[PDB]
Design a protein around this nucleic acid. Structure first.
Length: 853
RNA sequence: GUGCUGGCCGCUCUCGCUAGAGGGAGGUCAGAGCACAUAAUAUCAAUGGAAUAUAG
DNA sequence: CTATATTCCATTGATATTATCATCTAGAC
DNA sequence: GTCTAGATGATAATACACCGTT
């Protein structure tokens, strides 16, 4: 049920409601946000005061000292009630008895099916099997095993069941009822059952959302403390006291400062260096210990200091949740409320029995929707339709394939603009075949024979690249057990291409016009900044700045009129690329990402242009504009790219992707450029689109997947001038390939080999992905390494903490790796002509890249 | 059904003027293809701006 | 004027939790 | 019989990695 089904959802807006529906909704919301606070104040939770931004906090002890006054003699009961609702599951089905007045318990337990199959064969089942079955089940654990055996032996199954039922009844199932009598709890509809069932099931979700976050945070604030407490070194203390003195003189320490200071401390400068305080402080003999310290220890001393600094900025406890925002009310078909759905020609009717009907519109996401009632579910058939809002259109209306799903619940929610929405969570049906093949086999470096014997006899596989430019570069293939071809797949056999590497979509002609329009904005920003900082000293503009300002025609010839005209020029030149690239419905995806950065820099330009008139020494707080037009144009660009990848690999079983890394901390200098691509959400939007069609997906390591030879496994040099070319030097000959195709082919190659073959590692090799490699190729997982010859190595059973590479099948040293790149470079500036080779042509015999067998 | 777009006109805020640029709200003319898993809570990092030290 | 660095304020990228029922059972007609 | 609501349901699974070199 919830194993081989894909849960998706969508919403229909409720056009009109009749009956007591609004009273039903608002009572539920108000009772939820009241009893959530009441339950939060029972289970003593520590929390930080929102008033002072967590400067002070409420301890977990005064919460107990206050619950004692708030609750009274009922501490024992409430503790059990909270635990039962926190653990959840099946046993928490009868907790709605706290809000219901007409609740009726059952002194006899329900005769479940498992009880049935436990009853037919109790007599013919020996004593050693009367302990394992019952040690887990709590209900059955109320009777000793020997009593079970004797009862089964000398009684009739009916008279075992009739006798044994009263004891196995859970006693704490009326706990929520008895608490209501003890405290006199009054909800708003005490004589209704669906209301109570909905209310308790919604309150429990919001409390179990905070319980797991609380207990996780209070543990996460301990591992960092331990990690700092372990990494104590001399370099750590040196860096810490250096940071302390720089903070005494309000400088502070950064990684760039920690390397420039070290290097420039030894030498002497003439012009004032960007950093002077730090280098001067390094001049002192106090900080001479770290000058001879190894780099590996220095990194562990700096990272430990950064981690210790982050921990000092932690609140004692998480904030208290904000219950004010409305929840999403669920109503089902078996007990948890009730509804009937029946599709008409022009409307969809939802009938809440005593709470009135709801009339809903049709959508193009549920086109041609038909619903047939079944015993405890619905059957849906709908086709996605093209949403042509233009009355007269010039595009042919497209339809989609039939989709079948089972619907069993609906949701109602109220948006802040007072519009109710009906949500239909529907589950699609697909095989669990290839998801298991992807997750179980293609990802694990050491799959077991249990799955290996069950691998299919044929497959289709693919690969792709994701970059800011040339977004998708795919390659198709076909592997097959008992088949011969160039590609090699570990533990499975061989393979062969069916569609050679290429570029799915080249970047459009408008993608180069949008990259200079951002330089214009950045330079006009700095120009305006200098145009403001200069007036403080009453100086004069630089000639080059004025000449730059001159070209755009201004009404006057004032400099501050030139910038004011250029700001208008850029606005009028960006608004031309919105209406003109929207008219086409955002056709080319590559050029629709540069426009996003155009917008982003334009907002900062205006943000700094609205403050050009200020005076020194004051402060200018922002103003909170209300907009969501930048989070709704970015959420379309990560869906279109996901759909484009899926539609191409529609006749494939598995697709291989590299695991890109998201934006990082302040040390990295390119956080503002990987936030445009947003790789980690793009890889999440791709996965859902693939999963909707029963296709697996594997993420392989990206280390060095763009600087090898797909054929021979040798290293290559990437031209800095031209970023779409990579050069190789083999057999005293110079070869040329394409850069992105090399990435796609290497992604496929490490996909088929489970990426178990390494690219670069630094000897202490502690890793399920390299340990198996050492055994499979060299012979032992535990081996020592000693350098020899001209830069090769000889694996034996010394060097510690060194960066060893791998090219051509033999490990090398870092110096040799640099020198091969240098010789390729030295030869390429000698203008030696090279011949291009293709990865899609035939007559290639093997693919040794990232292969190690 | 949700989402994403500009031309143009008065009103009203912000700044400056040898001169105009930006924000909010409204009216009107057009354009309009292609994607859609929908929500509640909590935590971390940074981006952008402003000011302040500074040294040199 | 170009770097390093401190405080304030939205706003964004990213990842964790909570969810997307089934099967007796007693009463009316 | 056939609906139609209210009160109660064994366990119930799947990968891997950070340690220089701009």
């Amino acid at each position: 049920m919830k194993v081989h089904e894909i849960p998706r959802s969508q919403l229909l807006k409720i056009k009109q409601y009749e009956g007591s529906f609004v009273e039903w909704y608002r009572d539920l919301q108000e009772d939820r946000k009241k009893f959530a606070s009441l339950l939060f104040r029972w289970a003593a939770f520590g929390y930080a005061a929102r008033e002072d931004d967590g400067a002070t906090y409420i301890s977990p002890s005064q919460a107990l000292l206050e619950r004692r006054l708030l609750l009274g003699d009922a501490e024992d009961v409430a503790i059990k009630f909270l635990d039962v609702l926190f653990k959840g599951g099946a046993p928490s089905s009868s907790c709605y008895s706290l809000f219901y007045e007409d609740f009726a318990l059952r002194d006899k337990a329900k005769y479940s099916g498992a009880k049935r199959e436990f009853i037919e064969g109790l007599a013919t089942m020996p004593l050693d099997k009367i302990i394992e079955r019952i040690r887990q089940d709590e209900q059955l654990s109320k009777i000793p095993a020997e009593e079970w055996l004797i009862l089964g032996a000398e009684y009739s199954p009916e008279e075992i069941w009739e006798q044994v039922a009263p004891r196995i009844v859970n006693v704490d199932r009326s706990l929520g009822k008895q608490l209501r009598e003890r405290l006199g709890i009054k909800c708003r509809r005490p004589h209704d059952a669906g209301y109570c069932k909905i209310l308790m099931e919604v309150v429990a979700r919001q409390l179990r959302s905070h319980n797991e976050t609380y207990h996780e945070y209070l543990n996460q604030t301990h591992e960092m403390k331990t990690k700092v407490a372990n990494n104590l070194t001399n370099e750590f203390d040196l860096v810490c006291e250096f940071a302390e003195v720089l903070e005494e003189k309000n400088y502070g320490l950064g990684w760039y400062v920690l390397w420039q200071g070290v290097k420039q401390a030894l030498k002497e400068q003439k012009k004032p260096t960007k950093i002077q305080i730090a280098v001067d402080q390094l001049r002192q003999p106090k900080f001479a210990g770290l000058l001879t310290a190894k780099w590996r220890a220095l990194k562990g001393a700096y990272d430990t200091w950064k981690l210790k600094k982050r921990l000092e900025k932690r609140k004692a406890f998480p904030y208290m949740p904000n219950w004010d925002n409305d929840y999403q009310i669920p109503v089902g078909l078996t007990g948890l409320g009730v509804f009937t759905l029946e599709v008409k020609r022009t409307e969809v009717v939802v009938d809440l029995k005593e709470h009135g009907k709801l009339f809903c519109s049709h959508s193009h996401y549920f086109g041609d929707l038909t619903a047939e009632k079944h015993p405890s579910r619905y059957h849906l058939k709908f086709r996605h339709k093209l949403k042509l809002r233009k009355r007269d259109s010039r595009v042919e209306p497209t339809i989609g394939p039939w989709i079948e799903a089972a619907l069993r619940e609906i949701t109602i929610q109220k948006k802040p603009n007072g519009v109710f929405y009906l949500g239909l969570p529907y589950a699609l049906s697909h095989g669990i075949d290839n998801f298991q093949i992807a997750k179980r086999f293609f990802s694990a470096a050491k799959p077991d024979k249990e799955v290996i014997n069950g691998l299919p006899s044929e497959m289709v596989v693919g690969a792709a690249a994701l970059n800011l430019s040339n977004i998708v570069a795919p390659v198709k293939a076909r592997i097959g057990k008992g088949l011969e071809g160039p590609l090699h797949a570990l533990d499975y056999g061989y393979g062969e291409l069916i569609d050679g590497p290429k570029i799915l979509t080249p970047d459009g002609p408008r993608c180069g016009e949008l990259i200079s329009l951002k330089r214009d904005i950045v330079e006009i920003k700095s120009a305006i900044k200098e145009f403001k900082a200069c007036q403080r000293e009453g100086l004069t503009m630089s000639e080059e700045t004025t000449t730059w300002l001159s070209e755009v025609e201004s009404p006057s010839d004032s400099p501050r009129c030139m910038i004011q005209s250029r700001i208008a020029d850029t606005s009028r030149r960006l608004n031309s690329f919105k209406y003109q690239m929207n008219k086409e419905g955002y056709q080319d995806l590559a050029e629709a990402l540069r426009l996003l950065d155009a917008m982003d820099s334009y907002n900062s330009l205006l943000e700094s242009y609205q403050r050009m008139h200020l005076s020194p020494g004051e402060q200018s707080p922002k103003e909170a504009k209300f907009d969501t037009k930048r989070a709704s144009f970015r959420d379309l660009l990560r869906r279109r790219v996901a759909h484009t990848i899926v539609e191409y690999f529609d006749d494939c079983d598995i697709v291989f992707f590299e695991d890109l890394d998201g934006p990082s901390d302040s040390d990295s200098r390119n956080n503002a450029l990987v936030k445009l691509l947003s790789p980690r959400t793009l890889l999440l939007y791709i996965r859902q689109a693939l999963e909707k069609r029963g296709i697996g997906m594997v993420e392989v390591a990206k280390d060095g997947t763009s600087q090898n030879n797909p054929i021979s496994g040798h290293v290559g040099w990437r031209n800095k001038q031209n970023k779409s070319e990579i050069y190789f030097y083999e057999d005293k000959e110079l070869l040329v390939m394409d850069a992105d195709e090399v990435g796609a082919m290497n992604i496929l190659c490490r996909g088929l080999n489970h990426s178990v073959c390494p690219y670069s590692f630094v000897t202490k090799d502690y890793g399920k992905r390299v340990k198996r490699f050492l055994k499979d190729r060299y012979g032992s997982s535990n081996v020592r390494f000693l350098v020899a010859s001209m830069g090769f190595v000889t694996v034996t059973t010394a060097l510690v903490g060194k960066r060893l590479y791998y090219h051509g099948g033999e490990l090398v040293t870092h110096d040799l790796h640099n020198r091969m790149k240098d010789e390729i470079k030295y030869l390429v500036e000698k203008e030696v002509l090279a011949r291009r080779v293709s990865l899609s042509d035939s007559t290639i015999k093997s693919y040794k890249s990232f292969a190690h067998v």
